[PDB]
Amino acid sequence: NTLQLINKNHPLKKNQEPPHLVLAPFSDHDVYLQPEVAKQWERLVRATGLEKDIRLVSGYRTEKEQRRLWEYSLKENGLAYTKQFVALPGCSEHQIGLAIDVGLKKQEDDDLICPHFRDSAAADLFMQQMMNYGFILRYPEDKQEITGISYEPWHFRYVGLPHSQVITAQKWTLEEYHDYLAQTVRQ
Amino acid sequence: NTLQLINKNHPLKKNQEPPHLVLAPFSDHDVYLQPEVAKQWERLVRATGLEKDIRLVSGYRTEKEQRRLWEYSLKENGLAYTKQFVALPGCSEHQIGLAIDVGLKKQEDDDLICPHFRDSAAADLFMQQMMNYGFILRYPEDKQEITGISYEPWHFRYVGLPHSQVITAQKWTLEEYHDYLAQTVRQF
Ligand SMILES: [Cl-]
Ligand SMILES: [Zn+2]
Ligand SMILES: [Zn+2]
């Protein structure tokens, strides 16, 4: 299911089957994603003409890898910073291969926790079109108390169409989207 | 075992369990390595003053990830190129966290399978010090018949000291190092 809610309150199932994977294009290293996600990511980049401008920074990440990422951030940035920007192991969308971190292509010395993705024409254009290919901005600037994560302009979650367009037009989080669908079921 | 021989003729056993991992520094994305490898990698980069110049491109992959890499290259680049530069699933040193792919910063091109790591002052400086921190150049230029892999200037393998120093000084591959040790126990 592409609409699955993964977060602090909704951790992935211990018993969940691992996702299907393929290697994704438009990165400078090996990044893996669910096939449909890779496919729509590629379509999105080609349609916007951003092959030269943006790069895929991070994709599928095992639970153990997520734990190591968190532990690194703790040692380097401290607990409070880490809780802000890194999902707890088992609570990360990266573990199911539906999330991408995106960055700029010639941004040297970029940060792995918080890839630079603002104040550039490539980022703006990407934000104009991503919803048309199944992606939403997962952690918007004024939704911290709902998502539990600070503003992350580099992090995108695949939900597929028309969900991405519906969510983006209401400036919703995936959390609010799920509550809306639950409410509308009772009819 | 930091000397473990992994290639087409010596695949990983499926019972072997996974290496311990840490997130490695000096990269723009998340890369994981065995703790001692990351520690030595970090020491190496600092001592050579190559922080601004080089970067860690790839490290640990699962067999599943290795398979997806193999399959992609097969599809995109064809069997010939893929056989040359990509180890078969079960036959890649990346699966045990002892291998790093290293690339140059300030680049406007690098193939996905083959990170640019030649024609550079930083590459040269790196090639002079890496053995003093546990690393060997895994797939040298005229050893393709022995390693079963074409020349890969970017791929380094951690074996630890003094093994890396001994191997590099003889211009051996890990394959040849193993023969050397076996021949030596054979003359006892
Ligand atoms: Cl698959
Ligand atoms: Zn992310
Ligand atoms: Zn390699």
UniProtKB/Swiss-Prot annotation, chain A:
It catalyses: D-alanyl-D-alanine + H2O = 2 D-alanine; UDP-N-acetyl-alpha-D-muramoyl-L-alanyl-gamma-D-glutamyl-L-lysyl-D-alanyl-D-alanine + H2O = UDP-N-acetyl-alpha-D-muramoyl-L-alanyl-gamma-D-glutamyl-L-lysyl-D-alanine + D-alanine. Its main location: cytoplasm. Cu(2+) binds at residues 94, 101, 155. CDD domains: DD-dipeptidase_VanXYc (cd14849). Zn(2+) binds at residues 94, 101, 155. The active site is at 152 (catalytic acid/base residue). The keyword Repeat does not apply. It is an enzyme of class 3 (hydrolase). It is found in: Cytoplasm. Transmembrane segments: none annotated. Keywords: Antibiotic resistance, Carboxypeptidase, Cytoplasm, Disulfide bond, Hydrolase, Metal-binding, Multifunctional enzyme, Protease, Zinc. Gene3D superfamilies: 3.30.1380.10. It comes from the Bacteria. InterPro entries: Bact_PeptidoProc_Enz, Hedgehog_sig/DD-Pept_Zn-bd_sf, Pept_M15B. A dipeptide binds at residues 66, 87, 92, 94, 101, 154-155. Its EC number is 3.4.13.22, 3.4.17.-. Pfam families: VanY. GO terms for cellular component: cytoplasm. Mg(2+) binds at residue 65. Belongs to the peptidase M15D family. Homodimer. Bifunctional enzyme, exhibiting dipeptidase and carboxypeptidase activities. Catalyzes hydrolysis of the D-alanyl-D-alanine dipeptide. Cleaves the C-terminal D-alanine residue of UDP-muramyl-pentapeptide[Ala] (UDP-MurNAc-L-Ala-D-Glu-L-Lys-D-Ala-D-Ala). Shows no activity against the pentapeptide with a C-terminal D-serine residue. Together with VanC/VanC1 and VanT, required for vancomycin resistance in E.gallinarum strain BM4174. NCBIfam families: vanXY (NF000380). This is Bifunctional D-Ala-D-Ala dipeptidase and D-Ala-D-Ala carboxypeptidase VanXYC. The gene is vanXYC.
UniProtKB/Swiss-Prot annotation, chain B:
The keyword RNA-binding does not apply. Induction: Expression regulated by upstream promoter elements. Part of the probable VanC-type operon associated with vancomycin resistance. GO terms for cellular component: cytoplasm. Keywords: Antibiotic resistance, Carboxypeptidase, Cytoplasm, Disulfide bond, Hydrolase, Metal-binding, Multifunctional enzyme, Protease, Zinc. Mg(2+) binds at residue 65. Its EC number is 3.4.13.22, 3.4.17.-. The active site is at residue 152. The keyword Acetylation does not apply. GO terms for biological process: proteolysis. It is an enzyme of class 3 (hydrolase). Its main location: cytoplasm. Bifunctional enzyme, exhibiting dipeptidase and carboxypeptidase activities. Catalyzes hydrolysis of the D-alanyl-D-alanine dipeptide. Cleaves the C-terminal D-alanine residue of UDP-muramyl-pentapeptide[Ala] (UDP-MurNAc-L-Ala-D-Glu-L-Lys-D-Ala-D-Ala). Shows no activity against the pentapeptide with a C-terminal D-serine residue. Together with VanC/VanC1 and VanT, required for vancomycin resistance in E.gallinarum strain BM4174. Belongs to the peptidase M15D family. This is Bifunctional D-Ala-D-Ala dipeptidase and D-Ala-D-Ala carboxypeptidase VanXYC. The gene is vanXYC.
